[PDB]
Homo-oligomer: 289 residues x 4
């Protein structure tokens, strides 16, 4: 039997600074695979904004995410790392079901963060985080729920923005000691900080190189020098895809024809090639006739 988790860990071994790109849907997972990537990502913010057209305010449910996990892993063999936010539910039972369901859906790993989420019905969108102790319990529940020993439980901390660097590092160490297998320090502002986390936990470090945020657009070489194990680009393709779609919609609405934007489109031939369209009639010939 195949273990996507094993595949993720193997990818980390063969690619210093393992590049992991977010894939908004199954089609883009195939594009990323054809582009040469060894691992892909399912952004929680992407499931919300892309699949549901909703803001990343914790409105998405576990099932909205599972559906996307199944769609991508049903057709793409690359190991998929999944954004599990805070475990979809406050109970250890909720965290456990999330872990087991994502593994069953085909995911190679997931990251769970220390954010609080909504504490009250009228609680405004926020970046507040739970105590170190609460997150350790969250992590313990997630690790204990692993049905595939090679599935990866990555812990993410958003403590930098609300507690500063030293506190974030201290939390990170407690998270790893609790069982976290990899560390994801969110919104790091300086390259040297990644190195500090690396020397502090002794486990693979992921750097979220998303755009328009607090983190600079560090190159793979810069991240390698800082001992970063993974380079994540969570919504990069999604952002470009949206601009391109918007432009088509506008031109079509403005001019009553798409003539002016044909040159910006993936061709029919390219689409077929991307979805291994020909591997289908080939299988038919191999099985019959």
């Amino acid at each position: 039997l195949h273990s996507p988790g094993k595949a993720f860990r193997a990818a980390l071994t063969k690619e210093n600074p393992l590049q992991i790109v977010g894939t908004i849907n199954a089609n883009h997972a195939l594009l990323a695979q054809r582009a040469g990537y060894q691992a892909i990502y399912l952004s929680g913010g992407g499931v919300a904004a892309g699949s549901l057209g909703l803001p990343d305010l914790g409105i998405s449910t576990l099932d909205d995410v599972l559906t996307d996990i199944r769609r991508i892993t049903d057709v793409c063999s690359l190991p998929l790392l999944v954004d599990a936010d805070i475990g979809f539910g406050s109970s250890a039972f909720n965290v456990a079901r999330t872990v087991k369901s994502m593994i069953k859906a085909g995911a190679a790993g997931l990251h769970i963060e220390d954010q609080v989420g909504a504490k009250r019905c009228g609680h405004r969108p926020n970046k507040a985080i739970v105590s170190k102790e609460e997150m350790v319990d969250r992590i313990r529940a997630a690790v204990d729920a692993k049905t595939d020993p090679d599935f990866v439980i990555m812990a993410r901390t958003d403590a930098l923005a609300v507690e500063g660097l030293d506190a974030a590092i201290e939390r990170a160490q407690a998270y790893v000691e609790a069982g976290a297998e990899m560390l994801f320090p969110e919104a790091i502002t300086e390259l040297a900080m990644y190195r500090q986390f690396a020397d502090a936990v002794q486990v693979p470090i992921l750097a979220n190189i998303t755009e328009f945020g607090a983190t600079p657009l560090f190159t793979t070489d810069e991240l390698r020098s800082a001992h970063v194990a993974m380079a994540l680009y969570p919504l990069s393709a999604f952002r470009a895809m949206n601009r391109a779609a918007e432009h088509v919609y506008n031109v079509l609405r403005q001019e009553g024809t798409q003539k002016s934007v044909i040159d910006t489109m993936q061709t029919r031939n390219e689409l077929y090639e991307s979805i291994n369209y020909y591997q289908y009639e080939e299988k038919l010939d191999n099985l019959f006739a």
Copy 2:
């Protein structure tokens, strides 16, 4: 109670040549609405190639389509026309369940075509179509299943490529006579053909202006002169979005950073604006405090 079907019919009245753009996901449905469109489309080929990463060979299930219908209509109020292929089943019972399920999922209408399908396990893809009599039953079952009288049952015919113009028109009349409320003559090659269909059925006619196909890129004005009621652009934005995504994946892989393609990305402000991000905290302020 709101009826998307009623809204779709209304849209036809306030827009000669009603533009209908395919929306691959909920996010794009919101982009189309922000672009001023009054009706959107869920491409069957888009669900397959985009949501599932599979070719358009009838591998998609009713449920794959239902999921996209709900995701889109749960957040976008524009009426959604859905590609229902042949009804997802060979029995009148399947056609009925498909119709009722799509209505409940939130669709404003759907089109069912006269293609035969697979039939045999090792059957090769084709353009073969069922008998006029067979399609008539297919339509009768679909119309009978409507739980919302305003939901639209559109009949699509692929008879041109396999039976010729005169044959396709004969079928059309029979289809409409059977209850088809709108007509979708596929792969028309000449503008004058549309006019012929229009004069023959007396029901709104849809023109599928998809690229890289057999149909010229007719403008809305040209279509209006041919008495076309709807201009459909099924995968236009999808094609541009894939090309843009692919570009990001390649540049990122080749240069170790996305710096070079930032200018091709939708900004954070644009993303937030497009998903009505601000309306969320505004609702919290209106409800509480």
Copy 3:
């Protein structure tokens, strides 16, 4: 367009003490309809223990419940009251999505309660309830989210066991004042208490006559004398069904045949009659031939 919520409200009018029976699945919803009932219920504890085989500890997700709502209402026309627990999320945004999703799924109404929930990962099950103020917001968000004005928002309070009668009544009035359309005072022990709630809120009151609990098995006549508007039997059939199933499994295991328990089984004719089997070929004859 049909409104289940409107139908539910109508049912209350044609049945003093409106009997509402829990239906574990679609098949049982049809049995209840054939038994003459005018309203049915989807127990949250039933979804957990029956559909998921899990205890009622908040492990079930909104989607587990939505699936059962669709299955039941796609085939049974009776108005379905749904147990929505605390809204499946702590934010007003979750409450809103739950409401809108359940309406679209086909429900006629739902009840949300004032229980706190887990809050912490290692938190133990309890009967703790949020503040009166907190529940009020929960209700305001739910009512504001209604897409069908006739959909029912019922408020349930578990304040008796933890705060006493006088406290529970105070909350009730505040809840109704906040928009709660009907009231569900949980685990009432005395018939006279129901009358007190009824006289205090001026909205329909529901009595949860579930077995093996703190509430006596009050008859419909007794409840009518206490001004109870609805008599709920949440898992009654489920409990009998499990005992009967267990019997078959044991006898079959012990005797190597089911011969001995055939007389405890619904016959083939009864099954067909209950799922309107015959209506199917009758539709084929009416539509075709």
Copy 4:
């Protein structure tokens, strides 16, 4: 990694006449497990009549079945054999997706039959079957799609009723030679017939001991003597559960109280025990405190 298929094959080795009982939902799977069964079953007729309240006329979709597969296998470790009817779709691609999806959903095996299904929109419910050649292709597609070598592909033939015994046996041999791993001869009328199939295919034979059909209620001893490998009781518990539920609904409607039927109900304590209610707080104590 665990393989339910391996578990099914192992169960066959340790239990001559392996008893396999149908479990309508997750809860009943746990009851069957506590009753001592080593393997369980997901009836397609049960998914239709029980989960959807629909007749077994091919209206159910693959996803309706997958949902039930996930629900049962998420909580019960017993290997689950699944009714896959004819593969949900006429294409080899449809059969393949069905196989891969069911394996991913957690199933241990499935049986696919040689029925035709609906060949026309107005095709009445029928028992017609495809040619031997067509079924062989169906089987080849299913076996080739196996992602877990231990997953079981069982072929079922309904040829007895429309072609007689000799033809059914001939088909069976062709089905096994095509790759079928186990054989399911539907509606066998005589014990000696099972022995004939057994000697003819050299692979495990399953006897569908459902009630109210053409097959006598053969005991495990009788089946053992006929060399039957598995004894299936597809809807036995379901039938009893329905009668029990119906009775509760009737008494409640007739008498306005469930007092008279309390003795027919599984108690609250028994319900908790069945769903290992206590294993939950035990896990909390083991993980925390």
